[PDB]
Amino acid sequence: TYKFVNMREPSMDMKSVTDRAAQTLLWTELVRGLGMTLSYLFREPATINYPFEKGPLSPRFRGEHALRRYPSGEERCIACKLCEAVCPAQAITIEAEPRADGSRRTTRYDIDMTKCIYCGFCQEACPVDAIVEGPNFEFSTETHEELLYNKEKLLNNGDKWEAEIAANIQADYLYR
């Protein structure tokens, strides 16, 4: 099934010709456009009052990264390097070794936020929910070097945002 968009033929009787001439000489459609713009002027704008008002988000939103830990206070990351293997941008660097108590923990965990494409593959490849992409998005920076996160920065991000991150995970983990 197909439709014709511009296959009309104007009527050539005197009344229609006079109507077209009146449109030409009196600019009727121009006043129609003016009137529509005028009507648009008299309605409420759609502008929100940032930063005092914020745009709507969802639990699935992917923002700044964070490293979580168990309720006992022990970090969830076990240096399985799955997030590093799946990272499309090669933005994750991990080095590990046995801890003093023999635990399998990382000694280096860097994320280059100028390489990251914020796809969320790392947080869906993680089997222990250690690395997540939090809901923070207002972390602009004045220098390049501060966008090169290391393990301390990501752990601090997790400790900073744990409440909201855990609430979002609780809200959205049944869809995963």
Binding site: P51, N136, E164, A167
Partner: protein, 96 residues
């Protein structure tokens, strides 16, 4: 008609604690709307809602004038909101 809207403007002036509060809110947030206070923050931020506004304008925060170490009567930013009020304010959840 006109009388009702001017009366509502007068109530908006009254509801911010007088002329001083009206001017303070107008020069601090460029908005003079009044809504039910939803929450108070341990850093001083106040969180209000108004469900009769359209989506995106139904929730807002008046920032505190003094955060950890800096005066914040003028220099405010969105990174000041604590994570729980950050969740409520961004409409990720319906519960303060």
């Amino acid at each position: 008609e006109l009388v009702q809207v001017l009366r509502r403007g007068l109530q908006q002036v009254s509801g911010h604690g007088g002329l001083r509060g009206y001017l303070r809110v107008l020069f601090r947030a460029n908005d003079v709307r009044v809504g039910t206070l939803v929450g108070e923050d341990k850093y001083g931020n106040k969180y209000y809602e108004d469900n009769k506004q359209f989506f995106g304008r139904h929730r807002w925060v008046i920032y505190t004038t003094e955060m950890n170490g800096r005066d914040t009567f003028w220099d405010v930013d969105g990174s000041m909101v604590p994570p729980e009020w950050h969740r409520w304010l961004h409409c990720m959840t319906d519960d303060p």
